[PDB]
Design a protein around this ligand. Structure first.
Ligand SMILES: Nc1ncn(Cc2cccc(C(F)(F)F)c2)c2ncnc1-2
Length: 167
């Protein structure tokens, strides 16, 4: 038993809800929140800028120190940093950016990072401003993640479409 509420159960291990991930994180304070990161950990907008804003820019300060030491992430890769006021940990995961010509096949590699964590609150990777179709992202999630994932879907009309079309 965990503290996530109001999710629809899609499979043994995948749950979904129409929610802003920032609001879900503040209320639940999960062990792991997933950020939809880019390779530079430049959290300007989307999931990243909203989470970062909720941390009063502490996420960005920590991230800039990480990059100065380690260099950029790989597309499909991840790093674990602090969850600040939102979670114990933040798993920064880089999904492909379709608008930059990045291989959509790397979306599966991105979701594989979730399997290193028993329970996660996550958004639909590569959705929103990253230019991928949320319907495909959900399918890859279900077919790749084996740990327990609670998906916060920002858009209600897309949420209802994701549910109605789910196989
Ligand atoms: N605060 C937030 N900002 C951005 N996104 C990404 C996102 C934007 C637009 C649509 C969709 C989707 F999944 F419905 F297609 C996802 C968030 N997802 C959860 N919370 C979010």
């Amino acid at each position: 038993v965990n503290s996530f509420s109001g999710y629809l159960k899609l499979t043994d291990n995948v749950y979904i809800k129409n929610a802003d991930i920032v609001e879900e994180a503040k209320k639940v304070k999960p062990t792991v929140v997933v950020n939809a990161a880019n390779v530079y950990l430049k959290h300007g907008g989307g999931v990243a800028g909203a989470l970062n804003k909720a941390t009063n820019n502490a996420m960005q300060v920590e991230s800039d120190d990480y990059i100065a030491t380690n260099g950029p992430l790989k597309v499909g890769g991840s790093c674990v940093l602090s969850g600040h006021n939102l979670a114990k940990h933040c798993l920064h995961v880089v999904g492909p950016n379709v608008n930059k010509g990045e291989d959509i096949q790397l979306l599966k590699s991105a979701y594989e990072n979730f399997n290193q964590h028993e329970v996660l609150l996550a958004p639909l990777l590569s959705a929103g401003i990253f230019g991928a179709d949320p319907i495909h992202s959900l399918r890859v999630c279900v077919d790749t993640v084996r740990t327990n994932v609670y998906l916060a879907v920002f858009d209600k009309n897309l949420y209802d479409k994701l549910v109605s079309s789910f196989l």
